[PDB]
Design a protein around this ligand. Structure first.
Ligand SMILES: CCCCCN(C)CCC(O)(P(=O)(O)O)P(=O)(O)O
Ligand SMILES: CCCCCN(C)CCC(O)(P(=O)(O)O)P(=O)(O)O
Ligand SMILES: [Zn+2]
Ligand SMILES: [Zn+2]
Ligand SMILES: [Zn+2]
Ligand SMILES: [Zn+2]
Ligand SMILES: [Zn+2]
Ligand SMILES: [Zn+2]
Lengths: 342, 342
């Protein structure tokens, strides 16, 4: 709701993001072709998603900053930082799609799968990352929270990349990796690869912009936000297999990629030795029939109903955490986020 | 000389770099496997080079900072920042080797070509980049030049990535791209992809650490250092084809990769229409015989003698620039660098 009534404005501001990321270099004609390639990268890879992470910066900013301090310049900085979180996401997704050998993203073919792009996409991804710090300098250099924001984005990237490392290490291609797929391992992976940048980062950014920099307030916010992030990634795992492709915008690869997904972890906890064997001989391979066998096993073990029940229990757990840890922040900050993902 | 007598110490300090980049996370057991993977990444990809860029930080620091201010802690910060430049290099090289489809680097098989690594190397590369800002925070957070260093590394990365973008855009695979290969295009590519991070960055870092932050002193240093960087990349292009593989540590790919190298640019300037045609039908392709035909054409046009002459003329030009622009810095700062690359 509050996201919906910030959204269209948020998106309209992308043109200014792209203009400033192109004009700040108009003094250097020789890099014109690169700046043009950057524009094409931005428009293909930063547009077409739900923009939830960026909108969260904007929404939380409005709720944390006194209305009389919400001048036009402060608002502009708010939705610039929001777009920075979107650019970080864009960076991650371009690189992750190569590494997961994915086909489609946000309803179109993955950037790297586009003819003429290929592994040049690696440099495109790093360029998207670079844009973050260009925008922070351009818009936030003279603000008291400047360094707090730089370090938050840098730290969030490190954490996410540690998470990606765990994701990859736990899913070696061509191996049978079932004994590695535990609940304890899973919770660690998603905490790092998803939870910090998708939930802590956006709220923390708005917090620092509102002058809320205390270690205690950030630790309490984090308690709520990392648990939301854990649920969100479990949801991502569920939809990878059981989601509507016209809604998700992308084709799942978790089974073919031998991933430690919530689904396989739950499967393992429930499987008979006979089902375990079936899982063992069909998981982590590219053959459609082997993947289909896995999905059949998940359905036989009623993992969809297990998920639906987990979703409700998680929601209740998250709301309990908000009762405990939200103060002194407006509870609406976390409630609006929860409403978005549940 | 001054590099040689700083070197072994510089290298010995790598163990402390690796220890601190592993222990700063010992409070988080769950990411142990990732930290182990990080260690393996560091040891494979940050070791085995000449360390010229890192040593330059250390050497320039000793020459710019008054001896009485060179305490043990300041020295330690100096060779930490030196290793940061080495980590940036490591980041770039891992990614560049994937994008150039290279086989060997520093005398061993490229990281991504190592069995079991593959495109996971993309995340490894970004992890190396992340380590830079972890070390700066760990060692330099309370220093007055902290933000200057963060912004210098971030800006240098952006510039290098713009350069990489130009490098890639000018070398589309499967196309004949000769008309794109001009001197003007070439100078732009190497200014951005090589010159800023390999020469300006290390000296600028030492400068900020010495308290030299004036725009004018940095602009004058840059005048010398970007020209050195241009020569250095021309040298890199020459050695890609004409260097001794047991000395370079790597196999060239510029011709197969259809690159705008100094060599092809010089070839084009000198070729008859008949030689142009030969270049056109053999450049940018993977067949050994076609590559060999190109190298034969270069040798027929005596590009090796052209290079040797250019190297001498460039040296003289660089020394002239040092006479003009070195003050108020010790000329030895730039002379030691020049001696390293010429
Ligand atoms: C490069 C860092 C990637 C961080 C991974 N994120 C969770 C987003 C990518 C995914 O969620 P996605 O389902 O591919 O969108 P994955 O399930 O592969 O983790
Ligand atoms: C990812 C950014 C790469 C920057 C490129 N640098 C010049 C180092 C790589 C090279 O010098 P290298 O010869 O492969 O070591 P390239 O000739 O491909 O440019
Ligand atoms: Zn993915
Ligand atoms: Zn992934
Ligand atoms: Zn997923
Ligand atoms: Zn290369
Ligand atoms: Zn290259
Ligand atoms: Zn080269």
């Amino acid at each position: 709701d509050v996201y919906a009534q910030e959204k269209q404005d948020f998106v309209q501001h992308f043109s200014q993001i792209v203009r400033v990321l192109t004009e700040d270099e108009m003094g250097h004609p020789e890099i014109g072709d690169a700046i043009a390639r950057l524009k094409e990268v931005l428009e293909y890879n930063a547009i077409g998603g739900k923009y939830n992470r960026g909108l969260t910066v904007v929404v939380a900013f409005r709720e944390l900053v006194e209305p009389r301090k919400q001048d036009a310049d402060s608002l502009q900085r708010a939705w610039t930082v929001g777009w920075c979180v979107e650019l970080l996401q864009a960076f991650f997704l371009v690189a992750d799609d190569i590494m997961d050998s994915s086909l489609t993203r946000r309803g179109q073919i993955c950037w790297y799968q586009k003819p003429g792009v290929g592994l040049d996409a690696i440099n495109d991804a790093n360029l998207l990352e670079a844009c973050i710090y260009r925008l922070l300098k351009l818009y936030c250099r003279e603000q008291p929270y400047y360094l707090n924001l730089i370090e938050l984005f840098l730290q969030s990237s490190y954490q996410t990349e540690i998470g990606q490392t765990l994701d990859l290490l736990t899913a070696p291609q061509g191996n049978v990796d079932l004994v590695r797929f535990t609940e304890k391992r899973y919770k660690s992976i998603v905490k790092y690869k998803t939870a910090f940048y998708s939930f802590y980062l956006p709220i923390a950014a708005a917090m620092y912009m509102a002058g809320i920099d205390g270690e205690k307030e950030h630790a309490n916010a984090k308690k709520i936000l990392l648990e939301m992030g854990e649920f969100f990634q479990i949801q991502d795992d569920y939809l990878d297999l059981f989601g509507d492709p016209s809604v998700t915008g992308k084709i799942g690869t978790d089974i073919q990629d031998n991933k430690c997904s919530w689904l396989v972890v739950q499967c393992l906890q429930r499987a008979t030795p006979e089902q375990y064997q079936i899982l063992k001989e069909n998981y982590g391979q590219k053959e459609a029939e082997k993947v289909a066998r896995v999905k059949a096993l998940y359905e036989e073990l009623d993992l969809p109903a297990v998920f639906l029940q987990y979703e409700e229990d998680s929601y209740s757990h998250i709301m309990a955490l908000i009762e405990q840890y939200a103060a002194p922040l407006p509870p609406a900050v976390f409630l609006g986020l929860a409403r978005k993902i549940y």
